[PDB]
Design an enzyme around this catalytic site. Sequence first.
Site, PDB file in Angstrom:
ATOM      1  N   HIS A  59       0.823  -1.337  -0.036  1.00 35.01           N
ATOM      2  CA  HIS A  59       0.159   0.040   0.135  1.00 35.01           C
ATOM      3  C   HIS A  59       1.127   1.113  -0.080  1.00 35.01           C
ATOM      4  O   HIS A  59       0.379   2.363  -0.287  1.00 35.01           O
ATOM      5  CB  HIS A  59      -0.873  -0.070   1.270  1.00 35.01           C
TER       6      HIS A  59
HETATM    7  S1  FES Z   1       1.245  -1.184   3.262  1.00 37.11           S
HETATM    8 FE1  FES Z   1      -0.119  -2.739   3.261  1.00 37.11          FE
HETATM    9  S2  FES Z   1       0.634  -4.753   3.720  1.00 37.11           S
HETATM   10 FE2  FES Z   1       2.189  -3.076   4.246  1.00 37.11          FE
END
Ligand code: FES
Lengths: 147, 75, 378, 108, 241, 48, 67, 105, 51, 60
Positions: A112
């Site tokens: 993410h």
């Molecule tokens: S930012 Fe989503 S699993 Fe690490």
Amino acid sequence: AAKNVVSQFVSSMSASADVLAMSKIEIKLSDIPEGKNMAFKWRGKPLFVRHRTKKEIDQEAAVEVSQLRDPQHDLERVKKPEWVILIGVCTHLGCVPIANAGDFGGYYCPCHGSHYDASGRIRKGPAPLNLEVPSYEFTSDDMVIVG
Amino acid sequence: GRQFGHLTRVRHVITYSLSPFEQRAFPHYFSKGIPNVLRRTRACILRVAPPFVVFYLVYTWGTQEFEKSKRKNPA
Amino acid sequence: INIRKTHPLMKIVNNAFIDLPAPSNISSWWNFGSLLGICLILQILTGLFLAMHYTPDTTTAFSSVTHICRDVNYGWIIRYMHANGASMFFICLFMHVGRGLYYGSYTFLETWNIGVILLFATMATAFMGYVLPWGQMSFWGATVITNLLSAIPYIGTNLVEWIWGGFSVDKATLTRFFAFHFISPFIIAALAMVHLLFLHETGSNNPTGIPSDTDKIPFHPYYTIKDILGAILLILILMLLVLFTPDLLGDPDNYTPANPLNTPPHIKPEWYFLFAYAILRSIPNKLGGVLALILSILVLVLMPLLHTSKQRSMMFRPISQCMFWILVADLLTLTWIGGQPVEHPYIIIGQLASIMYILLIMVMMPVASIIENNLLKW
Amino acid sequence: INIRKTHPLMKIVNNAFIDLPAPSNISSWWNFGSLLGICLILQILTGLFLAMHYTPDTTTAFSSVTHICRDVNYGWIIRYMHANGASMFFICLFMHVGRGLYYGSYTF
Amino acid sequence: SDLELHPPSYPWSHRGLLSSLDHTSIRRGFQVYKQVCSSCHSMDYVAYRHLVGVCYTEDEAKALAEEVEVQDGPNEDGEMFMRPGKLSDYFPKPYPNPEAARAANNGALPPDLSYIVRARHGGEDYVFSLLTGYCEPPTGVSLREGLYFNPYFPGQAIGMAPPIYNEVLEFDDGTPATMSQVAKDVCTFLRWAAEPEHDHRKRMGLKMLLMMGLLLPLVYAMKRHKWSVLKSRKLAYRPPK
Amino acid sequence: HLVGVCYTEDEAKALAEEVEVQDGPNEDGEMFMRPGKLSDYFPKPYPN
Amino acid sequence: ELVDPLTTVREQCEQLEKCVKARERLELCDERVSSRSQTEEDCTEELFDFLHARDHCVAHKLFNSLK
Amino acid sequence: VSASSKWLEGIRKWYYNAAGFNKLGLMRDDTIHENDDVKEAIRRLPENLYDDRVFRIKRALDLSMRQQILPKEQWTKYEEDKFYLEPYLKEVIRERKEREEWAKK
Amino acid sequence: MLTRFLGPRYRQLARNWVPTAQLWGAVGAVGLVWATDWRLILDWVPYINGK
Amino acid sequence: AAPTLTARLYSLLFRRTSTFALTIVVGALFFERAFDQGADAIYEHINEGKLWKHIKHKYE
Ligand code: FES
Ligand code: HEM
Ligand code: HEM
Ligand code: HEM
Ligand code: HEM
Ligand code: HEM
């Protein structure tokens, strides 16, 4: 008679020859050249071992405590400046940080956009709290025991 | 303990009984239910309500409080 | 003679249900009790039949669950259903607590403390028993209460080991709690007949609140048939929420397979277990949280010790009643409080709710009692 | 008064074990009974503790058995042991049957 | 992306208190398996022997299996070469390794859908609102491009084409194709994996409605039937003198 | 198990490491070889 | 050009008044931040909102439409 | 049971019109929660009294089951209520104060 | 209501029970010891030193 | 009539306890299959969404 009986019965809940062994079973060599971030499979999760560089230490020491998403002064995680030991699972939705990647000289979560400084420390993305630090003691100079 | 016959002392009283099949199941059923019903309920209402009032006021209220608190602003 | 009178096991029986003289004034406050046992029975019953198929094995967890669900016809129904039914048992549970409360029935100690055993007992007995599904909710949450096992100074580490079986929650636990469930229900049962005989001893109170010897009948027909009724009411309840919208009460995180790396956002307890976890996260210290926890029911024990008024029924004590339904307001209040994840308003909110619990019971309810007394003038 | 006399749960108790009047002539035919229950208790007890570890899973059968045996310290002892103890319960069981028999106790 | 679309309520054909569906979209869901869905998907708890009675016929199901390569067990053979597969054969989902996912897309665990509706959260719209809500990032944002653009979603960015819109064109019986009957057949064959008795059990509920309405009165009556006399009692306090 | 029995911490240690673990996978399913640990069991013969 | 309240009614439906208002605030912010340089805001709130209405009516039509 | 005491003992009068007791026509004294002191207290009660409180009590149960109440007219006369026990009771209050007293001694 | 048992009478009662009270208390404490053999106290135990 | 229902069906039915019971199960049949049937009808008029499919499935 009752003392042994009762204390045998109670022991049978405390640990196991089996679970025990594997629990703290972990050692490391000194092959990790300053730079590279090794990785071990300890307790069913990722055990990251990073030998670090004066540059590394120096900069990580100079992050501000006051502004961190999870305020925690570098100098209190590692037991030795030079070495940083972590658990390799992203504290967000659980992917695995990428060794020396992302915008911060640490690791990178390819899920993410979760940026980690060299210590463990969250510096970009939803990630809540910084990567967590296992318990371990340095034995002789060449030996390190995680757990 | 109880059961009966050691039970208790009742002097100078009287009773009257009737066989079940005699009566009707629902005399004035709807009729008697009545502000009789509202007599119990309505009787209690005032005693009842205020806390619940505060409630709706609350889950509504704070619902707004945090809900709005989830909004983002400029600068 | 009359075997009803005669037969010794029956001699208990008639003495228990049948010949049992009982306050005629008796009130609907009743029903729940047999319900629970019926519940309990069904509980066991289903669990048993459930047990009959279900396996509680590590690889089998969701696996057998499917075999116990995706495979299991009416394992659908029985499973998810009487699973809900558990929650129903909780429903009449908290209810019933109310029953004593507005009853003020606290007059009978061994009963009260008894049902206290019933209390924490029910609580974890569920929780362990509950967690058995080992579902993602119950899973990372298993890391939760698993992290509850560590509280003590100098111990928890070794303790939450011993509890946890070791370095974490494990299949170790899986067996461990799994059994623990298997056992505890029985404990509930014998506990039951216990508290029961305790009841039959004193007899017990009346919604009226006057000495009952004036008026009594046997449960048959009266309380008997009435009970049959409330039972049908139950099958309406259970067989309803079950029958119609089984999943309605659920939290999707359950059907989420346990994903050891997961740790997702939510981490909540059951509508049953609900009001706690709020209370838990409320305070910023370990034993504050716990001692609070056991201090809610324990608090209720104190409440019997805190019993004050010269009159049993709050019925005659309206301001008291204000404290009563008001206290409830604090209660389901505490629910919806837990009904939010950690939030700015909530912080203060529950923060005060506790004071209430401490006031609205320990202070404001007792203070209330004293007050009503003052007013009483008789 | 005497709580021994007084306390209701106790009132059972004294009535059960304690205050219990019993034939003085009583004979060793007895013992087995409490044994069995002790057995039974231990039975449960052990089984319970046994249950505590043991898993009864298909792949786990001998597997957990090892974990319950080859792994299990005193799972050796408790396991195989109170396993035998079961048989002992049977021992006093058939015995006890004898007890009634030469007793002829069948009166009740 | 942290701002939850409260998924609108698609008047899901089953969205009624009792209400039904169509299948062979699920066959095209299997062909979404075969193509769209389970290329990257697991239903994995899915077992073909289930859907047997559902859609295809004894033969149609039969070949429907045999049409697939079993990858049979070993005959002396460990290894274990291929067979046609049986009805007993399940619904044989994709690439085995978890790292096979991690690599499949970059990371991107392609989870099993078996409960997904009943598992993940939200309703049919999670397919409709969310999934069919694959959409361009509005602004101010860039993925690694690893995430495609799916604005309706947790991150608004990843993963999916509308093989409807760009048609892998199948309606065997023929029609233009849409997401539902394989989406809610992924809800059904999730419920047909969960609540197939959502039909069958539904039936029973009907009788329940009557039983109480019958009994409940009959019960209550009986109760009154008992208690009635006690209701009307006349007991006299007539203290002597 | 035999750890405490015969060989020493090292002697057991190498005694394992002297054996090829056939380690688990690292990204690797497959799962190539390692030296094996004390935790490593007594790795018996041909599978099928 | 398949019947697509998604596309089809998104013309018809999204012509909606309130929808248009959100469009006003919407492109309004779009240019607003758009002018800015070196800023973190993507202003998703609007896009969310407009979407929310689009659905609100959408399923209130599309399904009733869709076949 | 009059205005101060129809507010206050009008928790027992107007608000036991609300809390029921006196509008239910109850016996003030009878409201004391049964206790031991209460117990033998009643044991010493006067006879004609005993009957009276009896009929009162039973009736209370009666409408209670009936879930009705007497005519608001029939609802008890305010004030105008002998404190039945209170001489007897309160006497016992001195009693258990006496057993309690030399007890303290 | 401590005044109930508060009086030179019951005071004297306490004065009686006191030494005994010490006794049973010791019973409990030592029990915790031997039972536990908890390291915390166990250390000070000479020749009960187990190593 | 209905007086012999209430009465004779007490008398010639509900009177004898057994007879009352045999009556009961005697119903248990008729009620059982019947409600089974009409119930099936309810679900039937409910949908026609499947198993009517065969003809549409062209019922090979
Ligand atoms: S930012 Fe989503 S699993 Fe690490
Ligand atoms: C001794 C009789 C009982 C047995 C044999 C039993 C056994 C089980 C088993 C095997 C499960 C897992 C399968 C499943 O979840 O469907 C379970 C779930 C559960 N049962 Fe019990 N249990 C019994 C009594 C109880 C009691 C007393 C309660 C408390 C009301 C209870 C409440 C639960 C809960 C909360 C769950 C987990 C939630 C769920 O259904 O998914 N059961 N039980
Ligand atoms: C295992 C769950 C419980 C069961 C099965 C159980 C069973 C019963 C039954 C059968 C009665 C008969 C009369 C009545 O219901 O009013 C009763 C009354 C009572 N119970 Fe429970 N009970 C349970 C939990 C509790 C709890 C949690 C408490 C309070 C801590 C409690 C305290 C009482 C009291 C005080 C009464 C007397 C009621 C009165 O006469 O007004 N019991 N119970
Ligand atoms: C679950 C296993 C059993 C338990 C726990 C049990 C428990 C007991 C206990 C505690 C006594 C007290 C007096 C004594 O032992 O002599 C007793 C006596 C007796 N038991 Fe059992 N028993 C069990 C099996 C049996 C069996 C298998 C029988 C015969 C079929 C039996 C028939 C009797 C009789 C007749 C007595 C009276 C003995 C006498 O007074 O001489 N019980 N039992
Ligand atoms: C409810 C308490 C009991 C539990 C929880 C329990 C559970 C178990 C379990 C899990 C096993 C398999 C593990 C093993 O074999 O070591 C077992 C074995 C057995 N237990 Fe029990 N059981 C209980 C009461 C009994 C009773 C009443 C008896 C009869 C004396 C009994 C006699 C046996 C026997 C014969 C075996 C198999 C032989 C063996 O030990 O290898 N246990 N039990
Ligand atoms: C009609 C067929 C498909 C359906 C119904 C479907 C539905 C879903 C659903 C409901 C989720 C979880 C949503 C959530 O977490 O809230 C999901 C996650 C995902 N699926 Fe699909 N999908 C399908 C086809 C695909 C395809 C073709 C791919 C390959 C691009 C794919 C790769 C993913 C991935 C990577 C995720 C994880 C999203 C994330 O957590 O970042 N699925 N899908």
